[PDB]
């Protein structure tokens, strides 16, 4: 409930992770997500936890997305099936996965005191970065944890851009009078996976004014994946010589 | 053939894997790929297969896309080096990695009966999810299983939005006649990895009209990975005093 | 170092994914595969400083996979730090879309590593644009056993809200009185953006009069936030304005 309408990124299975060592080939990162859970009448499938080959001050376990995400929490648990368990670490990220940054500064952040009870960490201030590395620091029997990290929703958008749908010179808005339409199909460079909104915009107006109203539009109808028709207008007695627009489509999700 | 055009997710490696459990570090999600054959001559590296280590109707291969992608089919395989195989299973979901959905409110899809012949699942409406998870549900010999996700295309945008792009107050489109134009060079805030496409459009006019007539444009120009430049333009007789135009320029894939 | 200095080390910032063709045994696998890795030398249970095939011969790979497309400018490849095992050339072929694969030189080999630890590095002949990308062993010495990494530039991402028709309502505030006018919308965005958004925002409806022959209308966010903004349309001077519309579209970077 601390952590409720957040992402856990391991769980769900949206991270990367490397590790710096690995004891042998079943107390790997396979071994890792919070509450991992192995069968306790075999000994063949290892640990219930990830742990290290090397027991330093120099081991770590790297998580990586390529879309960034606002960190909002670490949690830490210790080994399921032994008394080891990480006491205190620290953290490390980074956002353009070329310069490093350590939360606090480097300082020590309280880890876990027994095998199966969670301690999250709220990170001072959320923390925007692809990658983030649990660093541990100190450790009881050995350097061996579970863990999750937390992060907001994030939202995947993809965008095109068309440019230059015109009426053409001379158009049929350029007589008659009432509501009139000059409407001038559009389909996308490529079909979007769901429904798009559009933005359609003037970026070129040769028009005549009525009594010194000027009066135009121009609005999508019928937007679907594939396309959209571009409807420019207008109405009373204006006329319009011609009309130009550019598009912005955004499908999210 | 059924499947041409779709990407295969595990071969391409698009995907992170978790497993809820693996026999052992020679039996994990690293042998998982459909087809997915070893050394024949030698035992030390495992299964033609992922294989849990605990039996039972509670375990699981999660695949993770940070990317939401339209999930069109899921193919199961048995084991290459041995008889056992999936006989059916039940497909989850996540789109936004918080709530989880089950495919047919979780009845089994039919799996397979033998350890080679490829069985593929056509999902019966297409899923938009980031994470998709193989819960076994009946199985012969042991839970043992290769696997393949296809999914359609992605397609990847990276949008820059710049605001206020000016001519000037009383430009040099507010006087003399014929065309004219106002060039006002863009520089992006970041260099784009490919060409992208630029919309230009109006968010401030200040102009008179020649004879009722209005006359203005903006277009970009020199469209490079840098930036652009853009062109404010009049014709005839008019006389515009200022043009503000506001860009959204987006580069694909 | 100093030649990739800018550049993100994929491997070493867990941005790809990792499949192999075959893994020696579970302590020989691609968790084993980062440039420099170095292991316990003292005990022989966490295997080797390198990712080591099972089958040997010339169908073996690597294979990264990232979701969001990147340009790669170089592969380094390593050998196997603890025991005289390497790469001596291999070829690299890759995928933008997933669905094609194309082979790098056509297929020609590339030139690998002399030795356990000595990194060499090739930036390719021209950047390469792609999601996955693989090392195919072509040659060896003893057996299938690497360390590498891949060099690409930096990525930006972009996450976009687009909005239509913001609208200031017929015959508005702007269509009597003379002078500065405006008319405020408060626009919300469908959801909460996770860093400032800019904001474009376009006319796409106008219904006005001029005023001695003159056209005055604007339109402008105030107070944008990463919730939404405020649409501000206006007039000035003596020019009586109807009704103006708008679209918008919000961009946040990173
Ligand atoms: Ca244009
Ligand atoms: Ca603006
Ligand atoms: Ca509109
Ligand atoms: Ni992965």
């Known amino acids: 409930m601390s952590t409720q309408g957040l992402v856990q990124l391991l769980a769900n299975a949206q991270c990367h992770l490397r590790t710096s060592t690995n004891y042998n080939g079943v107390h790997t990162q396979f071994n890792s997500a919070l509450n991992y859970k192995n069968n306790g009448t075999n000994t063949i499938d ?23 995400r606002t960190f909002m929490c670490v949690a830490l648990q210790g080994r399921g099936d032994a008394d080891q368990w990480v006491t205190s670490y620290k953290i490390r990220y980074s956002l353009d996965n070329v310069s490093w940054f350590e939360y606090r500064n480097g300082a020590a952040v309280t880890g876990v005191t027994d095998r199966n009870t969670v301690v999250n960490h709220f990170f001072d201030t959320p923390i925007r970065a692809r990658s983030i590395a649990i660093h541990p620091l100190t450790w009881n029997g050995h350097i061996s944890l579970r863990c999750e990290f937390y992060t907001q929703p994030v939202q995947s958008s993809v965008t095109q851009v068309g440019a230059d749908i015109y009426t053409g010179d001379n158009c049929a808005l350029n007589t008659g009078s009432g509501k009139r339409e000059v409407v001038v199909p559009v389909k996308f460079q490529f079909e979007f996976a769901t429904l798009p909104k559009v933005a359609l915009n003037f970026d070129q107006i040769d028009c005549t004014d009525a009594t010194n109203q000027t009066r135009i539009g121009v609005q999508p109808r019928n937007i679907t994946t594939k396309g959209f028709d571009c409807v420019f207008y207008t109405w009373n007695e204006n006329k319009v010589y011609s009309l130009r627009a550019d598009y912005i489509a955004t499908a999210l999700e």
């Open 46 to 68: 290892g640990s219930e936890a990830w742990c290290s080959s090397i027991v330093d001050t120099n081991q770590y376990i790297v998580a990586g997305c390529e879309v960034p």
